[PDB]
Design a binder for this molecule. Sequence first.
Ligand SMILES: [Ca+2]
Length: 352
Amino acid sequence: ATDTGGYAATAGGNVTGAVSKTATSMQDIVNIIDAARLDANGKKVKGGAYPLVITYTGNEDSLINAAAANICGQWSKDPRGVEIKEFTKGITIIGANGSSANFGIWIKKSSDVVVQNMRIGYLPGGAKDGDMIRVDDSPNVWVDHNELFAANHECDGTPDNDTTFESAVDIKGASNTVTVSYNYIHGVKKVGLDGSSSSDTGRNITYHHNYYNDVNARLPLQRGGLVHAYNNLYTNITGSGLNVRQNGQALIENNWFEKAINPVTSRYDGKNFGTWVLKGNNITKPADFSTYSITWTADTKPYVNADSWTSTGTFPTVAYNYSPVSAQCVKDKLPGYAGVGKNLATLTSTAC
Ligand SMILES: [Ca+2]
């Protein structure tokens, strides 16, 4: 139906009248979307003329491998990405098994977009917003079962010493409902925003069943709104995890944290700290910090860490249906369900 296991409720291009097309390259995707705006008389229709299900069969392993072998050469290149602008008819971009992209997907002022089974990595243009997936002013977006990766590393001499690579999943603007699920995100410094600035507050986002490994920060960097993070596996977090800011509220439930510095915090603003409701994670009390290698650091400005591992606020009744498996099951089974080529498999109690 329109069940994503989170705030976003969409079927994307899988609706009545959907037109199935095969994209063999980045350019095909661009041309296919362009043609999907035309009605029977060749006239443009605002929002798109018909629903789409694009199956990407392209492979850019050569670009990815070359980039991996010389990471510091990526930031200064031109960014590469497909833009889904003002397309509200319903669109699903699914990669075929074995497919890969050295380009991102930038969604803007659209809605009902599903991006699945895409293996995206080592994108050029970190200094010019070379995001892997960007969700801007776009509600009902479901980013599911993808592998987004780069190298958790900052080359020196890059603009703002932060542009070696851009983000995995940046969300900003009026992207009111978004679900980010079953993604394998690794080797990424700035995972993803949830609000581009202090003023860009709001949105209701669900992060579930994601496997993060070797990521520095922003899981997400939340500015206001609501975030529901459940059944995620967070390992090797080298900077900070969920950074709840501008009075945002987060429900952090049944996740597995391990080898993480500041997994749950509120820093960098010095005020308007966000709150969290901790429930059912592998960590239940401070005594578990040493067990799972959780480390905490202070910050130059006033901050709040979850070092007491107690809930600091409340969370509204979650608007959707979902059934979280235990944190232990996440730890044991998630790596086989998250990512590409899993045939979009989901983790159920049964499989625990
Ligand atoms: Ca970005």
